[PDB]
Amino acid sequence: EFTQSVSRLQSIVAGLKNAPSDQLINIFESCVRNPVENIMKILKGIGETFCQHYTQSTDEQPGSHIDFAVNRLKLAEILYYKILETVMVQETRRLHGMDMSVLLEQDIFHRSLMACCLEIVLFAYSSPRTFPWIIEVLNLQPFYFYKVIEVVIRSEEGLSRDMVKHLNSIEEQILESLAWSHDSALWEALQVSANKVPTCEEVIFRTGSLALFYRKVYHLASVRLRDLCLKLDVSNELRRKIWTCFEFTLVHCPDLMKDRHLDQLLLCAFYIMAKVTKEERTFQEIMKSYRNQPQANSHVYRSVLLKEERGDLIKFYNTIYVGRVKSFALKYDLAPPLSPFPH
């Protein structure tokens, strides 16, 4: 009678409680600094905030009953402790019998794991509250939060294919737009790194949060470019030029991504590097092959930040992109370096 998503969630939490298991407790108590109290405070603070926003209405999101709020929350808490135990148990330092205090005292990890659990529960129930609702409510930076998604997927194998697909989907949302907003911690991380943006080669074969993030960005973009370059023309494996152009804009024009979408710069790279190379070269009807990609939405090419104001993709291309990238584009030529494309 339950949906297979809710049925799966029920069998994951079966026989488990709102609290840390005896095993996890042992792990907590083998730390020089026992995290258990601060973890409980975090869940409690997240729990209050969640219920407050869940209950009170907005113009976008009408409020729901406290009883459901409490039920979603208890499920997420159960999920939280089960997954946390699995994460801690499988951790290298535990295998080697090393004090895990530092790992367990990172607040952003705990907040993110708990938010991700709330997200799983909400998705399972087909909640109207759509990501990134949960992290906006809980005041969680996308740039920090997204790293917990890979952890969750690999630490809970009871997750259905659909669940994993949804978690990967919200990771892509963070990688393509959410983490590039003007208030994103990404810009701060960039700042302490002296505004040096990882090239693609640098993150393939560094290692700070900046590196890991751009690694996932480049991978995501390469997958979308490869698909695009396997649909319309369809392209020469050059497309090493389109990639190189795109990488140029990430590295040497990172501001172009601020409050924008990753596909907007990818498609402009496609267009401009089409035009100059005298191959083929394609009009913005590129969208036909693009719109068939799952992440593609009309807002992506129909509403694009310009300066308020907003405009379509072609307009953004003409007023902003061309001026910034044409010095690079024109060197591929009638009258030379290329970036390695990841496979």
């Binding site: 913005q284 379509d312 291309y317 003409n318 061309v322 584009a329």
Partner: peptide
């Protein structure tokens, strides 16, 4: 020569792509 695109998307999806 300019790389500007002379074109528009002000059309609608039904028309633009069928």
């Amino acid at each position: 020569a300019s790389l500007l695109s002379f074109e528009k998307l002000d059309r609608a999806s039904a028309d633009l792509w069928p």
